[PDB]
Amino acid sequence: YEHTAVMPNKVGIPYKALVERPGYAPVHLQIQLVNTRIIPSTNLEYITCKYKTKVPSPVVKCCGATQCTSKPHPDYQCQVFSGVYPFMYGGAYCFCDTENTQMSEAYVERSEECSIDHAKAYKVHTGTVQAMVNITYGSVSWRSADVYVNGETPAKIGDAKLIIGPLSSAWSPFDNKVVVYGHEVYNYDFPEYGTGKAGSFGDLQSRTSTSNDLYANTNLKLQRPQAGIVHTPFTQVPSGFERWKKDKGAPLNDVAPFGCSIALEPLRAENCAVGSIPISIDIPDAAFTRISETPTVSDLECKITECTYAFDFGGIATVAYKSSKAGNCPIHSPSGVAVIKENDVTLAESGSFTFHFSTANIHPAFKLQVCTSAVTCKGDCKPPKQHTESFTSAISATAWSWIKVLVGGTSAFIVLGLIATAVVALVLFFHRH
Amino acid sequence: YEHTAVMPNKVGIPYKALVERPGYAPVHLQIQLVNTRIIPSTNLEYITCKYKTKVPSPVVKCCGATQCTSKPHPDYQCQVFSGVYPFMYGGAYCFCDTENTQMSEAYVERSEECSIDHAKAYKVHTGTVQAMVNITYGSVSWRSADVYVNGETPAKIGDAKLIIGPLSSAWSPFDNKVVVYGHEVYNYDFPEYGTGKAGSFGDLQSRTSTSNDLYANTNLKLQRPQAGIVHTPFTQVPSGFERWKKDKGAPLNDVAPFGCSIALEPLRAENCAVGSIPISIDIPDAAFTRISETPTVSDLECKITECTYAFDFGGIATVAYKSSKAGNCPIHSPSGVAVIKENDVTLAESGSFTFHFSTANIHPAFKLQVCTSAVTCKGDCKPPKQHTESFTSAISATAWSWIKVLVGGTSAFIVLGLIATAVVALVLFFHRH
């Protein structure tokens, strides 16, 4: 036998159902979520880090001059200078005349620490949905298994079959472009493909983790050495990666709506509570029993002792009962005005017991069924003072309803009386002739 | 200096442009596509192949009976039978009484040939676009390079800079789900995630290439052995993979519109001709020259010898000319009514030469410019008899235009004459008083 329903999506709150199979004793099942792990479909774009400039040893000549050539290197540079007359330690200083020799080539490549800290850019698409569920029905204990979310993929837990999803909404917390660094992500929605920005966020963009091309600029510039001392001055913009490190905005894990964290490795967006789920479960037929083996329940009386609406179980009521024989059978509230803390209760001859429940209404009016038997427990008013409540404009109190019906009735009475008087006046004239 | 335009997308047809830089001699450039390789973004779902059933050696006993247990195997089976009294070669036949012993377990797993032929399911998203271009301008020879397609990514070819794309249309030949087998693909838009179909297309669905789970059924069934001979009969549905192999529909590479083939390895959808492209190129300023170094062109006269509109170059015309000095400078037709087969021509003093061109109009009216000088060559009518033609309702012939203007003028004349006569009649009466 199988059963279908719709369950609101929330990680903590359980769900209690009571399946009916005519000619058999009812069975109740209890299902509770543990996770909701949205997973997107992603691909890498490139990585970036802090750069480093290196310079090979320059070359000079005691006389004459040479010319430098351009080589295929990322932001390669070379240039020549004139009239050096250099100097060395206790040396002849490598000059006798106008020198006019200087190489001063410059060279850019990735840093040695790029292997550890490095932003990554990504493109994002919808991807899959999956969760995990802990289950218990009849007398079987807690059983847990995971399952995808779509109205097609079965999964067996113990001896039951499950078909859940798809979700009621297509909402997601990600955008088309994201960036991942260190431990968290950001909606830095505008990386750049091949165009750097002279050190704003892209100035060293390795297409892969160990590529050999860095299609971005650093605005490197050379300078003329002075005072005849062998060195290679230069100048360049400071790395923009540092600047973005200093001015990162709010990380996504502190702005996501609906209160859902963000794991890293699969880009899990866990627990993001929204909407409802269509559920459909089948239980084996070996867990039912003949309807003539259960104690018949009759002569019921439910009395409300004390209650108060709060996020915890703040309601207690008692029931008096006349049994057929001793046994145990479950209890449940099909209506949603109040939730029943208890699930199943034992019964003795001439039963009389109590339970617990939460609610959200001043005057609870919930009606419960037990052991194939109905009973209304209209309760009373409860004093005022995270968990399952309705809050469906059903808080109109006795005085509130009293006043509203009073004013409506008064308005109706006066208008109808006036309408009657109009035709009362008219019919006289209609009779005068 | 840089130049921008829009070019129609077609693999073969080249594109000739003539950049102008005031105070300099014009330069013409020639750009020609070689490819257009749409690439989608894809991820694997599972693979499938033909299955195979194996059976371990069954166990019997000369007396008594045993019971078989269920093991965690894909579509595991076991069962027991009664009263065997089996037989063997020249043996005692392993019986003295009612045997009632039979194991006959069955077992399903992948075939040994699954490693080679196996369908794969995929999910598809937009992905990137890229192409390759062969370039030539001024006097530089043919140069070729590839480049992505977006209005952001530069690529340098020789000494020029390129920025092309994005495309004029977002059309694609793929759907959300595709299947790849052997050499080609199909829009078999409905694979199945975890639910088999007892041998229709999914009956052995390994989540990966070498997974250890096969979440699909084959409707395996056992049978009772007869005549006391040691064997394990059974029955099952034939593999549905074979059936789909026999009844594959039209492969995609024979139904794709717009005439574009399908490579395999990256799922390239090459050459799919559609729409136009915004182009923007910059040439170095070292390829211009002062406007006072080119031969001045004056006293032009263009004469059309013979032409006929066909997909090849079927038009020839001659030009007489009076030069300033010998030299070479290009020729071009800014208008699109006709295309010029030639690109640049030499000039001698008192020039007079010819060229070739295609067209698509009965009365070509194209006007060409040469060497910083304009000339109209109104041509004449050409006799009737893959390449760049307009076909823009501009085929109205001389007789056609004659008749149309005749009928329009006649209708206008008669209606206006009648309108005039109306007020002519009216004004008389307006004058009678």
For B195, which of A152, A192, A193 is closest by C-beta distance? A152
For B154, which of A123, A154, A194 is closest by C-beta distance? A194
Cα B406 to Cα B413: distance, rounded to the nearest angstrom: 10
β-sheet bridge partners, residue B19: B27
State the CATH class of domain B289-376: mainly beta
Closest CA to B362 of B379, B386, B342, B344: B379
Report the residue of B149, B162, B195 to disrupt the A interface, i.e. the one with the largest count of A CBs within 10 Å: B195
Residue B195 to residue A150, Cβ atoms within 8 A: no
Cα B106 to Cα B232: distance, rounded to the nearest angstrom: 9
Residue B148 to residue A41, Cβ atoms within 8 A: no
- Cα B76 to the center of its chain, rounded Å: 47
Residue B194 to residue A152, Cβ atoms within 8 A: yes
Two tokens, residue A151: 């109205």
Cα A62 to Cα A71: distance, rounded to the nearest angstrom: 25
Cα B44 to Cα B188: distance, rounded to the nearest angstrom: 15
Using CA atoms, how far residue B424 sits from A164, A248, B248, B353, B412, in Å, is: 87, 86, 80, 63, 18
Which residues from A are below 8 Å from B41, CB to CB? 41, 43, 123, 125
For chain B, how long is the longest CA-to-CA vector? 145
Phi, psi (degrees; rounded to nearest 5) at A261: -70, -175
Two tokens, residue B340: 């010029």
Q: Name the helix (H) or strand (E) containing A424.
A: helix A398-432
What's the gap in Å between the CA of B392 and the closest CA on chain A?
40
Report the residue of B148, B161, B176, B193 to disrupt the A interface, i.e. the one with the largest count of A CBs within 10 Å: B193
Residue B193 to residue A154, Cβ atoms within 8 A: no
β-sheet bridge partners, residue A215: none
Two tokens, residue B391: 């076909």
Cα A229 to Cα A94: distance, rounded to the nearest angstrom: 11
According to the 3-state scheme, what is the secondary structure of chain B? CEEEEEEECCCCCEEEEEECCCCECCEEEEEEECCCEECCEEEEEEEECCEEEECCCCCCCCCCCCCCCCCCCCCCECCCCCCCCCECCCCCCCCCCCCCCCCCCEEEEECHHHHCCCEEEEEEECCCEEEEEEEEECCCCCEEEEEECCCCCCEEECCEEEEECCCCCCCCCCCCEEEEECCEEECCCCCCCCCCCCCCCCCCEECCCCCCCECCCCCCEECCCCCCECCCCEECCCCHHHHHHHCCCCCHHHCCCCCCCCCCCCCCEECCCCCEEEEEEECCHHHCCEHHHCCCEEEEEEEEEEECCCCCCCEEEEEEEEECCCEEEEEECCCCCEEECCCEEEECCCCEEEEEEEECCCCCCCEEEECCCEEECCCCCCCCCCCCCCCCCCCCCHHHHHHHHHHHHHHHHHHHHHHHHHHHHHHHHHHHC
Residue B152 to residue A43, Cβ atoms within 8 A: no
Report the residue of A123, A130, A176 to disrupt the B interface, i.e. the one with the largest count of B CBs within 10 Å: A123
Residue A195 to residue B148, Cβ atoms within 8 A: no
For B152, which of A123, A148, A195 is closest by C-beta distance? A195
Name the pairing type of β-strands B367-370 and B374-376.
Answer: antiparallel
Residue A195 to residue B41, Cβ atoms within 8 A: no
Q: Tell me which residue has tokens 């809050």.
A: A391
Two tokens, residue A280: 């459909």
- Cα B96 to the center of its chain, rounded Å: 76
Cα A237 to Cα A229: distance, rounded to the nearest angstrom: 25
Instruction: Please name the amino acid found at residue B197.
Output: K
What's the gap in Å between the CA of A373 and the closest CA on chain B?
40
Which residues from A are below 8 Å from B150, CB to CB? 193
Cis peptide before B40 (omega within 30 of 0): no
Name the region of A239 (left: φ>0; alpha: ψ -120 to 50; beta: rest).
beta
Closest CA to B135 of B4, B6, B28: B28
Q: Tell me which residue has tokens 């335009």.
A: B5
The answer for residues whose C-beta is within 8 angstroms of residue A234's C-beta and 6 or more apart is A53, A55, A104, A106, A220, A221, A222, A223
The helix/strand/coil state of A66 is coil
Residue B192 to residue A150, Cβ atoms within 8 A: no
β-sheet bridge partners, residue B51: B110
CB atoms within 10 A of CB A141: 7
- Sequence-distant contacts of B345-350: CB under 8 A, at least 24 apart: B345/B370, B347/B295, B347/B297, B347/B321, B347/B323, B347/B371, B348/B323, B349/B323, B349/B325, B350/B321, B350/B322, B350/B323
What's the gap in Å between the CA of B195 and the closest CA on chain A?
7
CB atoms within 10 A of CB A273: 15
Closest chain A residue by Cα to residue B155: A194
Which residues from A are below 8 Å from B194, CB to CB? 148, 152-154
Cα A405 to Cα A420: distance, rounded to the nearest angstrom: 22
Closest chain A residue by Cα to residue B147: A194
Using CA atoms, how far residue B405 sits from B376, B415, B419, in Å, is: 25, 15, 21
This PDB structure is determined at a resolution in Å of: 4.2
β-sheet bridge partners, residue B355: B317
Two tokens, residue A80: 């020549």
Cα A347 to Cα A350: distance, rounded to the nearest angstrom: 8
Query: After which residues does chain A show a gap where C to N exceeds 2.5 Å?
Result: 385
Two tokens, residue A79: 């240039």
Method: cryo-EM
Phi, psi (degrees; rounded to nearest 5) at B152: -135, -25
CB environment B254-273: b (16+ within 10 A), e (fewer) = eeeeeebebeeeebbbebbe
Question: What does the CA dihedral A171, A173, A175, A177 come to, rounded to 10 degrees?
Answer: -140
Cis peptide before B166 (omega within 30 of 0): yes
Report the residue of B44, B124, B125 to disrupt the A interface, i.e. the one with the largest count of A CBs within 10 Å: B125
Report the residue of A39, A125, A129 to disrupt the B interface, i.e. the one with the largest count of B CBs within 10 Å: A125
Cα A346 to Cα A355: distance, rounded to the nearest angstrom: 11
Closest CA to A87 of A96, A98, A95: A95
Closest chain B residue by Cα to residue A40: B43
β-sheet bridge partners, residue A297: A323
Cα A178 to Cα A186: distance, rounded to the nearest angstrom: 6
Which residues from A are below 8 Å from B195, CB to CB? 152-154
Residues B329 and B344 sit within 8 Å (Cβ to Cβ)? yes
Which residues from B are below 8 Å from A150, CB to CB? 193
CB hemisphere CA count around A295 (13 angstroms): 21
For chain A, how long is the longest CA-to-CA vector? 145
Residue B125 to residue A41, Cβ atoms within 8 A: yes
For A43, which of B41, B123, B150 is closest by C-beta distance? B41
Instruction: Please name the amino acid found at residue B124.
Output: V
Residues B164 and B279 sit within 8 Å (Cβ to Cβ)? yes
Q: Tell me which residue has tokens 């719709």.
A: A6
Which residues from A are below 8 Å from B125, CB to CB? 41, 125
Reported in sequence order, the residue ranges of A360-411 that DSSP labels E, i.e. its strands, are 367-370, 374-376
Residue A193 to residue B125, Cβ atoms within 8 A: no
Closest chain B residue by Cα to residue A153: B194
Which residues in A have their CB inside 8 Å of a CB on B?
Answer: 41, 43, 123, 125, 148, 150, 152-154, 192-195
Closest chain A residue by Cα to residue B149: A193
Which residues from B are below 8 Å from A152, CB to CB? 192-195
Closest CA to A236 of A389, A107, A338: A107
Residue A193 to residue B150, Cβ atoms within 8 A: yes
For B193, which of A125, A152, A193 is closest by C-beta distance? A152
Pairs across A and B, CB distance < 8 A: 32
Classify burial at A212, counting beta carbons within 10 Å of its beta carbon; exposed 0-12, middle 13-18, buried 19 or more: exposed
Residue B153 to residue A195, Cβ atoms within 8 A: yes
The helix/strand/coil state of A115 is helix
Residue A148 to residue B43, Cβ atoms within 8 A: no
Q: What is the DSSP code (8-state) at residue A207?
A: S
The helix/strand/coil state of A427 is helix
Cα B46 to Cα B123: distance, rounded to the nearest angstrom: 11
DSSP A308-339: --SSS--EEEEEEEEESS-EEEEEE--SSSEE
